[PDB]
Write an enzyme that holds these catalytic residues in place. Structure first.
Site, mmCIF file in Angstrom:
data_model
loop_
_atom_site.group_PDB
_atom_site.id
_atom_site.type_symbol
_atom_site.label_atom_id
_atom_site.label_comp_id
_atom_site.label_asym_id
_atom_site.label_seq_id
_atom_site.Cartn_x
_atom_site.Cartn_y
_atom_site.Cartn_z
ATOM 1 N N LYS A 157 0.838 -1.186 0.000
ATOM 2 C CA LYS A 157 0.000 0.000 0.000
ATOM 3 C C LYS A 157 0.878 1.243 0.000
ATOM 4 C CE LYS A 157 -3.652 -2.588 0.431
ATOM 5 N NZ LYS A 157 -4.684 -2.761 -0.624
ATOM 6 N N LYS A 183 2.380 -8.903 -2.214
ATOM 7 C CA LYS A 183 1.677 -8.965 -3.505
ATOM 8 C C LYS A 183 1.321 -7.600 -4.078
ATOM 9 C CE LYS A 183 -2.736 -9.929 -3.631
ATOM 10 N NZ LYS A 183 -3.203 -8.607 -3.962
ATOM 11 N N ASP A 185 -1.274 -4.990 -5.609
ATOM 12 C CA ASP A 185 -2.716 -4.829 -5.536
ATOM 13 C C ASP A 185 -3.352 -5.306 -6.837
ATOM 14 O OD1 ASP A 185 -4.926 -3.880 -3.844
ATOM 15 O OD2 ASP A 185 -3.488 -2.378 -3.154
ATOM 16 N N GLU A 186 -4.608 -5.749 -6.736
ATOM 17 C CA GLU A 186 -5.292 -6.300 -7.903
ATOM 18 C C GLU A 186 -5.329 -5.313 -9.063
ATOM 19 O OE1 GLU A 186 -7.027 -5.594 -4.940
ATOM 20 O OE2 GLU A 186 -7.476 -3.650 -5.861
ATOM 21 N N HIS A 276 -6.508 -13.702 -7.691
ATOM 22 C CA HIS A 276 -7.290 -12.694 -6.995
ATOM 23 C C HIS A 276 -8.691 -12.659 -7.594
ATOM 24 C CE1 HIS A 276 -8.810 -8.784 -5.765
ATOM 25 N NE2 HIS A 276 -7.812 -8.655 -4.911
ATOM 26 N N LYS A 316 -12.828 -6.405 6.793
ATOM 27 C CA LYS A 316 -13.585 -5.276 6.267
ATOM 28 C C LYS A 316 -14.555 -5.677 5.163
ATOM 29 C CE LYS A 316 -10.167 -3.907 2.767
ATOM 30 N NZ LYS A 316 -9.037 -2.993 2.446
HETATM 31 O O1 LIG Z 1 -7.229 -4.276 -2.132
HETATM 32 C C1 LIG Z 1 -7.501 -4.719 -0.990
HETATM 33 O O2 LIG Z 1 -8.411 -4.294 -0.254
HETATM 34 C C2 LIG Z 1 -6.608 -5.873 -0.489
HETATM 35 O O3 LIG Z 1 -5.337 -5.676 -1.014
HETATM 36 C C3 LIG Z 1 -6.614 -5.829 1.043
HETATM 37 O O4 LIG Z 1 -5.784 -4.799 1.442
HETATM 38 P P1 LIG Z 1 -5.698 -4.641 3.181
HETATM 39 O O5 LIG Z 1 -4.992 -5.955 3.502
HETATM 40 O O6 LIG Z 1 -4.919 -3.363 3.447
HETATM 41 O O7 LIG Z 1 -7.145 -4.592 3.639
HETATM 42 C C4 LIG Z 1 -7.184 -7.209 -1.016
HETATM 43 O O8 LIG Z 1 -7.211 -7.194 -2.411
HETATM 44 C C5 LIG Z 1 -8.597 -7.507 -0.442
HETATM 45 O O9 LIG Z 1 -8.571 -8.064 0.831
HETATM 46 C C6 LIG Z 1 -9.321 -8.467 -1.388
HETATM 47 O O10 LIG Z 1 -10.542 -8.738 -0.803
HETATM 48 P P2 LIG Z 1 -11.016 -10.437 -0.949
HETATM 49 O O11 LIG Z 1 -9.815 -11.066 -0.258
HETATM 50 O O12 LIG Z 1 -12.330 -10.533 -0.201
HETATM 51 O O13 LIG Z 1 -11.086 -10.688 -2.443
HETATM 52 MG MG LIG Z 2 -5.895 -5.429 -3.135
#
Ligand SMILES: O=C(O)[C@@](O)(COP(=O)(O)O)[C@H](O)[C@H](O)COP(=O)(O)O
Ligand SMILES: [Mg+2]
Ligand SMILES: O=C(O)[C@@](O)(COP(=O)(O)O)[C@H](O)[C@H](O)COP(=O)(O)O
Ligand SMILES: [Mg+2]
Lengths: 450, 450, 91
Positions: A157, A183, A185-186, A276, A316
């Site tokens: 982040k 990783k 971010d998506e 993801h 969250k």
């Molecule tokens: O972009 C985001 O929010 C994260 O990087 C979490 O960051 P934090 O660890 O700072 O919250 C993940 O992609 C989500 O958890 C995906 O949700 P799921 O796993 O339900 O697909």
């Molecule tokens: Mg993410």
């Protein structure tokens, strides 16, 4: 015997006496008929328009044996219709074809105002045309040399905005501090502020540096998600060329056809494939309309991801505990019996396909570790993004806090302790000997999600 | 200035004074907050978690200028939130990246129990990174040599079960009888009863035979949809080798990454690309959650489909008239101004991209033609599947009925007649000279959808 | 008017023929405003200042270079002898 005109779908496509075959593909649909349309006619419409039928009788129905190919609603329990599809309706090895039939058009009919696909029984005969994951849990543990505990990870982040240099710096601090993996971010693919070639080069340098300094094997889930299949494969090849153990792909946004291509190449390249589930909540959030995630999880394991996000329950993002426990079993076990308490409508034989690592991620911190270990056990990844970089002293200290918390709770579970009942005490015990963990517990103690 | 801890999303990601730039990507979200969550915080959470933010403050936020990269909710009208995204956040030419950000995670947050993306403003500077349709309406009309009327199509039925030989027999009857085109069902790919190589060969022989006997140009939308990008490209290449004018892809089930790959290859092969929207109703149907189809249509035109289904309004599948009028403009016009009456939240400049053919299909018959021509005008395909094969005397007769109906109504409109007020009379007029049309009107005269 | 991502096309229009007209005996293109929407069709530098400074591990000063001389005539062996002396000496 061709008699032109419209007929109710239930004439041909409702058969409460039909007994499913072991080779049939079975679906459980939760149907909300248009007011005035009986449940039998609504379920027959779904069956008809997802297999062989249309809105009026056609002369060409005489040119084949529809009894051999038609889908049939064979059972209704309240608003849940059970539909059986003969094996011969589906193209071998193609999830794309499954979707094109089962969820192609039947969600937009005026006669069915809401429709949710709850579950699907994949017959063994059809599973044998799919490769499943290329690595699997056991092989992956051997590659990382990590046993007896969950694996630690975390998203870098801020999601976007970091240069490749600053980005690999955070990666290094995390991995150096105790995380097994980090990783992209998506939504971090290739953008003006952070181009993929730069990031892959910079990050793999940080991975090697932390692995050498810690003596532990590390990896980074380099996102190859791109606008075309060719571009994604190009990035996977660069990742392998750089010696990365992992790549990452958004399998729903990129889509299943390209996902299959990437999974094929990942195995050829020796890469492990983190998947993801970006966009899943667009389809699977509402209980009255869409596709439940447990179906997407099955498709995911059929195509063959090495990991897939499963939710955190306590984080969250939304996720039900019972349903998640069932999805973890669908991903990891050889055979999963039906269970109404967890929303598993069918027994699922996995025909020897490799298991998938669940990944719990999203708004979790140290105080959630007892819950996470209680839900998933050891065979899972716990990802701490904000829960790592948000530490008062930064990413390295945050990584240490999360690593210690996970090891302390995993050890307690293995010792026979009740980690939910003694969750706080287990963490406090570890905090006395770990200031980083203590500071993390103080910071987020008041942060909770219902 | 790094202060650890959770901060309100709106502190950084809500800015009601922000003035959007021409280069910004704009989104209109309809938000259903968790009870007790203020609208401003919910909208800010969507903005933050689709751009740069996360659930807690991170030390690495200081390493970049978030003010330059963050998304911002700049306007809230009731439950509609307007969010602006800087141009630098997006990978050039990747719809996949758009989705990974805009709809990646923000639909599954506990704080937002429902979320629907209503519209999106694609800025010109980002549009210039996309190729658009490879053929376009005008070039396609030249290839078929058809002007001044809607074009006739029709899905072969039953959806599945027909052998390649019988499948091509139905195709020949339809084309011989008046249809400009026919098409594979979305779920007909390659199956034991009908393998794709057989179908492609049988069908193109039928297409040539009908073109020679009618003296009019014909086509069949051969479905290349498959389980992997490579297999889809292989089937496209075979369609071109056979001299087909068209291929067809389910662009949502196959996915956008493989969609781009097929679109690139189609242009290289000189093929026209029909795009079926299978799976769209899974998430564009309900007004409280998902993605409106108008957003999917914009993405479709950016990647570059030559046609896309748009619904019929009056057919068996759901569709609003006003919203369909706007979507038709979005697919066909160079510039589409905002229009609240049609759900067009933003003006859309198309930056010179070629236009797309709307395709109206699903449960329509002769009586619907006045409405269809009134909604779409001439630049559209009308598909009659059951409405052709369900004719009392078979597909060729049905094709003649639909062909005569469309030409009679299209002629009436060009004459200045009010085809909605005189719709019935126009069809009775033609029926008195076309027994096929008269028979079709009698059969389906009492079949209506709300 | 312009082909995406083609400086060649820019030149073919802007400086293609208009410098050789009898009606305009001299013409100089002083400047050009490249719009953002057209800039987004070009990739720009592959490395850039910051990445390059990281590859050389040089910060806070100008970088030193130098053309090998004489321009032409040196054998490969002697050419590399001059290169080594320059780099060994501080370039
Ligand atoms: O972009 C985001 O929010 C994260 O990087 C979490 O960051 P934090 O660890 O700072 O919250 C993940 O992609 C989500 O958890 C995906 O949700 P799921 O796993 O339900 O697909
Ligand atoms: Mg993410
Ligand atoms: O599978 C079907 O039902 C069709 O072949 C129609 O058959 P009939 O022509 O016999 O009704 C089309 O795919 C739908 O119209 C698509 O719906 P949309 O166009 O809304 O995507
Ligand atoms: Mg169809």
């Amino acid at each position: 015997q061709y008699e032109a005109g419209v007929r109710p779908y239930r004439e041909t496509y409702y058969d409460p006496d039909y007994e499913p075959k072991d080779t049939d593909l079975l679906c459980a649909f939760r149907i909300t008929p248009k007011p005035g349309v009986p449940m039998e006619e609504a379920a027959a419409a779904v069956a008809a328009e997802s297999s062989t039928g249309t809105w009026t009788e056609v002369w060409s129905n005489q040119l084949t044996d529809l009894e051999r190919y038609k889908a049939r609603c064979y059972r209704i329990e309240g608003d849940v219709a059970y539909i059986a599809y003969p094996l011969d309706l589906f193209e071998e090895g193609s999830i794309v074809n499954i979707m094109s039939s089962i969820v192609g058009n039947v969600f937009g009919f005026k006669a069915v105002q809401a429709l949710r696909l709850e579950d699907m029984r994949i017959p063994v005969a059809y599973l044998k045309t799919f490769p499943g994951p290329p690595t699997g849990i056991e092989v992956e543990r051997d590659r990382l040399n990590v046993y007896g505990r969950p694996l630690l990870g975390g998203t870098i982040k801020p999601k976007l905005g970091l240069s490749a240099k600053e980005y690999a710096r955070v990666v290094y601090e995390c991995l150096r501090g105790g995380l097994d993996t980090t990783k992209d971010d998506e939504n971090l693919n290739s953008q003006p502020f952070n181009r993929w070639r730069d990031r892959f080069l910079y990050v793999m340098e940080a991975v090697r540096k932390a692995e050498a300094e810690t003596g532990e094997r590390k990896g980074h889930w380099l996102n190859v998600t791109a606008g075309s299949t060719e571009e994604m494969l190009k990035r996977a090849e660069f990742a392998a060329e750089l010696g990365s153990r992992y790549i990452m792909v958004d399998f729903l946004t990129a889509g299943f056809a390209a996902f299959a291509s990437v999974r094929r190449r990942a195995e050829e390249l020796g890469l492990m494939l983190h998947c993801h589930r970006a966009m899943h909540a667009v389809f699977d959030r509402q209980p009255n309309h869409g596709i439940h995630f447990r179906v997407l999880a099955k498709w995911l394991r059929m195509v063959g991801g090495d990991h897939v996000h499963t939710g955190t329950v306590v984080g969250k993002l939304e996720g039900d505990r019972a349903e998640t426990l069932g999805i973890a079993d669908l991903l990891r076990e050889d055979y999963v019996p039906a269970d109404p308490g967890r929303g598993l409508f069918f027994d699922q034989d996995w025909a020897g396909l490799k298991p998938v690592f669940p990944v719990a991620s999203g708004g979790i911190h140290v105080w959630h570790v007892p819950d996470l270990v209680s839900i998933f056990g050891n065979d899972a990844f716990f990802l701490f993004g904000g829960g790592t970089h948000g530490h008062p002293r930064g990413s390295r200290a945050g990584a240490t806090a999360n690593r210690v918390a996970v090891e302390a709770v995993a050890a307690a579970r293995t010792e026979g302790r009740d980690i939910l009942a003694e969750g706080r005490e287990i963490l406090e015990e570890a905090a006395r000997s770990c200031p980083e963990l203590r500071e993390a517990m103080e910071l987020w103690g008041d942060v909770k999600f219902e």
